Amino acid sequence: GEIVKTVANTVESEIKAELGVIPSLNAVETGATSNTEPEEAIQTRTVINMHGTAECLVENFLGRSALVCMRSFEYKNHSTSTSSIQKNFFIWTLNTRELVQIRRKMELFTYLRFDTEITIVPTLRLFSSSNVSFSGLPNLTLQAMYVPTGARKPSSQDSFEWQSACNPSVFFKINDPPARLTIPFMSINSAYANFYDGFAGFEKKATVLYGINPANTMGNLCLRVVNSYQPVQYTLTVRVYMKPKHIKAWAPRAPRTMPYTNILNNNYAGRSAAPNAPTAIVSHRSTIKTMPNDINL
Amino acid sequence: GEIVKTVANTVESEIKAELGVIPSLNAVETGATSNTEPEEAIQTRTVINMHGTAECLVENFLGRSALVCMRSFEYKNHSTSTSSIQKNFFIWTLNTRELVQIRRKMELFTYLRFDTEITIVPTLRLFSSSNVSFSGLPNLTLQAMYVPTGARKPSSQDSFEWQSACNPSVFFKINDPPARLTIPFMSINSAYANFYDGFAGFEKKATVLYGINPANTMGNLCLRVVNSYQPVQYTLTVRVYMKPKHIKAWAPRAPRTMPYTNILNNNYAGRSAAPNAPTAIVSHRSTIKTMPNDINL
Amino acid sequence: GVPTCLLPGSNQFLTTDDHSSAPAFPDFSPTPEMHIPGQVHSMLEIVQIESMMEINNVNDASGVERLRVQISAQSDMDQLLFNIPLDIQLEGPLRNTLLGNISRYYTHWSGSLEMTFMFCGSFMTTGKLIICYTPPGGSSPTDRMQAMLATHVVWDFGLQSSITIIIPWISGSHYRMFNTDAKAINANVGYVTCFMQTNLVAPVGAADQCYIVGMVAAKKDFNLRLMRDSPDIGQSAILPEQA
Amino acid sequence: GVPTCLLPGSNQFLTTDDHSSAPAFPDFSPTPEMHIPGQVHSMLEIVQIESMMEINNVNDASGVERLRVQISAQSDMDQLLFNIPLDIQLEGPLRNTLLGNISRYYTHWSGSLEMTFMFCGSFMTTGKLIICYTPPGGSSPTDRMQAMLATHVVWDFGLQSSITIIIPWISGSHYRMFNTDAKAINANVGYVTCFMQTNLVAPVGAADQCYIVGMVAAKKDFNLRLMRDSPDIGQSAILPEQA
Amino acid sequence: GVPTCLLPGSNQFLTTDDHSSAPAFPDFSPTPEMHIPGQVHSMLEIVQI
Amino acid sequence: QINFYKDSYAASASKQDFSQDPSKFTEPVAEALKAGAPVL
Amino acid sequence: QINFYKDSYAASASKQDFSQDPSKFTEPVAEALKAGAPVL
Amino acid sequence: SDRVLQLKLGNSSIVTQEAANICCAYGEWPTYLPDNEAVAIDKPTQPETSTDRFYTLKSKKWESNSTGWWWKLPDALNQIGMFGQNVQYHYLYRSGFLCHVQCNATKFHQGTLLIVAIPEHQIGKKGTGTSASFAEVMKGAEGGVFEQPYLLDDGTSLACALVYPHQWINLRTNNSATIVLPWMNSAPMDFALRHNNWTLAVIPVCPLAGGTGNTNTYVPITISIAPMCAEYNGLRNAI
Amino acid sequence: SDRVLQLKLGNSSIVTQEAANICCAYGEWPTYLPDNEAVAIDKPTQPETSTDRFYTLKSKKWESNSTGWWWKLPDALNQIGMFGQNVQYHYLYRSGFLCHVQCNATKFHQGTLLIVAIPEHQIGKKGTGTSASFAEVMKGAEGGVFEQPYLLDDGTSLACALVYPHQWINLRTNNSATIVLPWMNSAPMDFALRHNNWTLAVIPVCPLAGGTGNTNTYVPITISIAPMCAEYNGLRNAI
Ligand SMILES: Cc1cc(CCCCCCCOc2ccc(C3=NCCO3)cc2)on1
Numbered sequence A, B: 001g002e003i004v005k006t007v008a009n010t011v012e013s014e015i016k017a018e019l020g021v022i023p024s025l026n027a028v029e030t031g032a033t034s035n036t037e038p039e040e041a042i043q044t045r046t047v048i049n050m051h052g053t054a055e056c057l058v059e060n061f062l063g064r065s066a067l068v069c070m071r072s073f074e075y076k077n078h079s080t081s082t083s084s085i086q087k088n089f090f091i092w093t094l095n096t097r098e099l100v101q102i103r104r105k106m107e108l109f110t111y112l113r114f115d116t117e118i119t120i121v122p123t124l125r126l127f128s129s130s131n132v133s134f135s136g137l138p139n140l141t142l143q144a145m146y147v148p149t150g151a152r153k154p155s156s157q158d159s160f161e162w163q164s165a166c167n168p169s170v171f172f173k174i175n176d177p178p179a180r181l182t183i184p185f186m187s188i189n190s191a192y193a194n195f196y197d198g199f200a201g202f203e204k205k206a207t208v209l210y211g212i213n214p215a216n217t218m219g220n221l222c223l224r225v226v227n228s229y230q231p232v233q234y235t236l237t238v239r240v241y242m243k244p245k246h247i248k249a250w251a252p253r254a255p256r257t258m259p260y261t262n263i264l265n266n267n268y269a270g271r272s273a274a275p276n277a278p279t280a281i282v283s284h285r286s287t288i289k290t291m292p293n294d295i296n297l
Numbered sequence C, D: 001g002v003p004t005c006l007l008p009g010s011n012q013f014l015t016t017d018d019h020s021s022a023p024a025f026p027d028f029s030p031t032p033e034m035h036i037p038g039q040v041h042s043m044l045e046i047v048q049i050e051s052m053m054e055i056n057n058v059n060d061a062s063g064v065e066r067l068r069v070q071i072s073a074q075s076d077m078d079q080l081l082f083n084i085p086l087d088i089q090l091e092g093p094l095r096n097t098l099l100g101n102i103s104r105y106y107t108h109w110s111g112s113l114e115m116t117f118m119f120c121g122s123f124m125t126t127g128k129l130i131i132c133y134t135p136p137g138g139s140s141p142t143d144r145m146q147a148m149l150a151t152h153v154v155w156d157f158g159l160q161s162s163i164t165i166i167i168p169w170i171s172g173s174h175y176r177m178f179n180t181d182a183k184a185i186n187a188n189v190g191y192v193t194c195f196m197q198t199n200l201v202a203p204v205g206a207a208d209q210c211y212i213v214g215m216v217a218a219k220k221d222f223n224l225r226l227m228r229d230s231p232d233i234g235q236s237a238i239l240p241e242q243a
Numbered sequence E: 001g002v003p004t005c006l007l008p009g010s011n012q013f014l015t016t017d018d019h020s021s022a023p024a025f026p027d028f029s030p031t032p033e034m035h036i037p038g039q040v041h042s043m044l045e046i047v048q049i
Numbered sequence F, G: 001q002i003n004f005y006k007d008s009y010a011a012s013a014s015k016q017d018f019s020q021d022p023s024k025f026t027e028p029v030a031e032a033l034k035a036g037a038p039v040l
Numbered sequence H, I: 001s002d003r004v005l006q007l008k009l010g011n012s013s014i015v016t017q018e019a020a021n022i023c024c025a026y027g028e029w030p031t032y033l034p035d036n037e038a039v040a041i042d043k044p045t046q047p048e049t050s051t052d053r054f055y056t057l058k059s060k061k062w063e064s065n066s067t068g069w070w071w072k073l074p075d076a077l078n079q080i081g082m083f084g085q086n087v088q089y090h091y092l093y094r095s096g097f098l099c100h101v102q103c104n105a106t107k108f109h110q111g112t113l114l115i116v117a118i119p120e121h122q123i124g125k126k127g128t129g130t131s132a133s134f135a136e137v138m139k140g141a142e143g144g145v146f147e148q149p150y151l152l153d154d155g156t157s158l159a160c161a162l163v164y165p166h167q168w169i170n171l172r173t174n175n176s177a178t179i180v181l182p183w184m185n186s187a188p189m190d191f192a193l194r195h196n197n198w199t200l201a202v203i204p205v206c207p208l209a210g211g212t213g214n215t216n217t218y219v220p221i222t223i224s225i226a227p228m229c230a231e232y233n234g235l236r237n238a239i
């Protein structure tokens, strides 16, 4: 382990014709990457590089705010002849696999440990009814409460699990800056696992799904409109952005090539034709001797 | 009294066969909790724990903002042929027993001393009339004034007890951040008492209710809409959240098991069936030898 | 003025924030502190106290019968007496305990536990029991043949009327979850079984049928995290001043 | 109060900001770190690992045939074997590589690359190849007459079954773009060609037709800038818990 | 600019707050104090009469 | 504790105090019971 | 790192660490392969 | 140190033979009120021998279906001797209490009593919204009877009643219990006729039983309470 | 140092002649769990010679159309010898694995095998939303067969499979491969019957072939796995 502020420099070289020295020849069967340096592989000069490597760090690779949730729900009167349930709220079943870009950057590494900064951005619209008139959006109050594993799940807008006596909750308005807070590293293990080659339960039944981690029970995020229902119908879209910090990564993975189909597992259906086809990840070319982008003069 | 930054460590042990030494045997008739250490009760290894205990402190157990009040009232024209009273306000009769979660966490200890941070979150709605049109919520001004014991209680929105020449009052808008302030420890005694086994008056009549503390006369909270009535009817819901700070707790209680029925006393009706039934706090199982969650292979 | 930019998270009300606030009563003089016995500094001090548990939680026992357990003079040998699940989150004997009630405010727990069983027979009643904690992974032991292989303590009645068994922290992960799925790996703790070792022997003058009282507590290495609203108590409306 | 003016950029949510935020769980105690092998500190450590590439990316090869290249005993001399474009941004052999996949998250790249070719014939099979990197500016070389003039390495099969050619950083600008126009000056890197040097000779008992496996990686002087959402993976709707 | 977040209790008017305020009359010169008999410093001095 | 205001009770959450005396609830006996010995 | 809040995990992005050990992925061999020599 | 014990206060002296130990509530011993914590300015009266002595209350029979009994302090002693007289002639009071519970049974008998001192014990009645009346709460030395010992008549659990200072009388090894209680109030003193600090509750966890010759054995339970460090302020006429 | 190698663990000793080198996963050697990282408090059992030894699994024939094979650890050894017995009698386990792959062919044969140790390898099935069943995943020492070695049965790429520790068996210069794997878990220990840390996958990159007299040569591939630094905690009955 050595400190690399800038990439390696290049030193000047001369003619090299020596017996028993073969830098260009390598034995990749040993599993070791070829160590042939450019300096004595070819005829080089002296080059000094000031190019920084800070942006290539995992700190900057992952510590960048990415969308992980987007729920849209109706804010209206949901009462009926006998309903008594407002249902102006949503639950998320906390996870980080619904958005493919952030999911792929999670799964570039086997193990990740980080404290995450969470930003909530709400947006409002009016539903287009037969007779609707818009001249402004109300400044509604929204409560986002984290419900940990095994705690009560609110069943309605008017439910009394929204007291948040112990459950952390954040109150914010539409016109206020988007809500922001920080979740510490909250895994029962020493790191989050993007893959779990096993089962989360002791059972041998088909109910226990393969690949479920008995450490990914992150809990739930219950978001509600604090204001009661309005005379006219609205729609609220909440976007939750996740930003890792204080990141350590372990055992880099093979990058995902096929589109994700669900969040429970890493199954894939493949695309109809290349690229990223079942039998064809890279698109076809004419032959191995044709150049697809030939510069012809 | 010793400082406990992290939980106790474990030391390695060997075979123990000595006469006259019986760590596993205890005399709980003395009222003392069994002191049998895991190290010499079983065969243990050396384990060093870095697990912090800060979140298990009473400071963090109680110093967490919890809902203690929620009043909803109509903001409209309440005048009639001869009323002359606007009545666009509410009184609370200050207490901390209307919400069961915060009440239970209060009553986990006999005595509590703390300075409380109070947050007021208002929300507006339009009443759904026969002909109502909504395109925005007004930015109303609200005055929340604490009226101590024996002081005047305002009788209307236009009443003149809202001068607040000595009574502390806070003015805040709907669109502004929720109001926040701090009440110091204001008991005539050295601590708040969650239970009072006695009567608050010298009388022997039935009017003096048992369990009323002659130190819980906290006063009143009078909240008003400063703006006069609008041409159309609104509804205001005010939520008051209470957060203890600088907390000392004395004489821990037995946790409450039955649902509360009122705020004047700790009477209970019990739930129809187990769990938390009058005769059955914990739900039934088949027999004492059956396992309700058996893992069958 | 000072250059300033409002970051995201401004104008928000977080119920877990830690900030100073404007004092409503300026220059107020609080009552001086008076020494009161029994001051509590941590929640971990109360989970270490003994607390009886409802082993007899069957639909035949009403009230105090549920805190006490049948013990019989046996006409057979090697018979199982009673079982104890260790699912604090779910409905079991360990929920209505100081340890259970306090830890159910939290989501993650760690550390070894202890169980004390007190014999409440007659002075002339003798007996031998074996109490076994079995780590999870399989089914509950039904015969002493399989129960002896796990952690166990042999209790002989005498001058000391109570025995203590330590349930050690045997877990791959640092912490365990109070998950509604008690059957999962992160939530399952293990099994507790009681087997008669030799027999329960009482003379003719003494009552033949005796009782065990079970109690559970935590040790010095117990830890809790992610405190939550407990499902112990509920509410459907604001509590009035009436019935 | 303190004089204050809100500058432009207040009340904005920038996804690349670096500011402290309110902790949602006060005084939370995280799990202590445990040593795990294979800790990664920089993305540049993974682009330096070998990674096979799809040289045989034609509409006749299905799966693993695309990671391996036909090599023939020739009835002629000086014949071209295969070509390798160096357009990481566009659809080519170098995209599905560790170097390619990681660098496609970035927009600008710099530094020399390396290619290792491993011969997978029989021990009695002998042969000589020449691998030439040609700097951009003209057409791809078709004859060894023009290919020998650019950078090249002569590979002779033997005990060492793999050869390494360094593609040096020959660019006027400090960095190069992963531009969709691979034909532009800022994006074009050059050409890679393989020519038989003498022949591929195998005995009668040995298989006449052998294979080369090609691999590409970066050197110590490799740099990346302006990281971007990769076009590798797409999404049309929120991923459900179903098919 | 300086990183800043508006806490709850911002934009509120508390009648018992203790903060400095903008002077409406800049560089105003008040009348010098003159000794007046019977100065009161505490309310507790009058309950003792 | 930062306490931007004049009154001390207006400060934030008090500085952490980890002093623990479980004995007052776990061994509230006048005669101390020594570990590893018959406690009668 | 400025960390205006009490908890340390509430701080901003961690201070830059440029330590690089590519060998663990590039030369994970018990016997070190010397450069410029037949590696067999 | 042994299972024997002698408690000698004033003219009273209780000797016990099958005891366990002395339980001091929260690890404290009752003491006189110091100056820094005093509120009343007139001198309190401190009659040591006349009040700090054992008062024996009227016994209860332990039945097979007994639910339990409770005595509220200082209500149990408010009508007895110099302690009661000083309570009647004075407004403010302060004293700790040493409680000793007697229960004698043969070695062939089985049964277990939990003797728990609950501080500030608010009785909550069940199936009604009305608070408990003065007659039901203030019972004097004659004591009270538990409706629901399973719930401690509070809505709480008897299982979790071990936070409070407590003793077990197990007939195998005990016949007497001793608990020492210091002052329990948020105030230095209080009014005795309207408030009780402590509630001593004896709950039979395991029923009394005998085999074939010891059934229906009349076994009484006796309560002896000794005030300690009693101070009284505010002398006036009796009420 | 040379192409020869001897691995002697316990009673087992493997000598290889046409080897390349020893690949240590991420440049680490398996070690026993230290105190500062331990979680379980009872002593773990450490049977050195009885468990830390080479177990030889059942061989597979290398065909011209072979797609590849995979063995999940410690599932492959969960049914074998003292390692399997200690896994069955214990809840928690921890061990590294030394994997040795044998493949013998003549100098006239050609072919290349990639032996890759993938950590935490979640198998993703193709053309279905249903997760893989217990039967398909937990295969024991009998092993598994790759549907899509091109995708590693993960949706990933075989081309990018060189991040994982790996060996090449090239018939020109190799007949044996050796990879050493330390503990791979976010936790110090785990449950063996429900989770696998490592997956050893042998994928034929270049098909086995011969010229005019060496076609259809029956060439087996053998797997020998040696646990190292095995600890077990939580003694109980077998399951
Ligand atoms: C792999 C892997 C990685 C992880 C980390 C998941 C944590 C980040 C998910 C997004 C967090 O979502 C939250 C949103 C809001 C709140 C919040 N708490 C108090 C009020 O709202 C908490 C979490 O889990 N598995």
Ligand SMILES: Cc1cc(CCCCCCCOc2ccc(C3=NCCO3)cc2)on1
Pocket (backbone or CB within 6 Å): B068, B094, B095, B096, B106, B112, B116, B118, B144, B145, B146, B168, B169, B170, B181, B183, B192, B193, B194, B216, B218, B221, B240, B242, C024
């Ligand atoms: C037990 C026990 C504990 C207590 C403490 C109760 C105090 C906290 C109750 C909530 C405070 O409610 C207030 C709300 C607003 C204001 C305020 N004062 C100036 C303007 O509004 C004051 C109190 O009382 N009994």
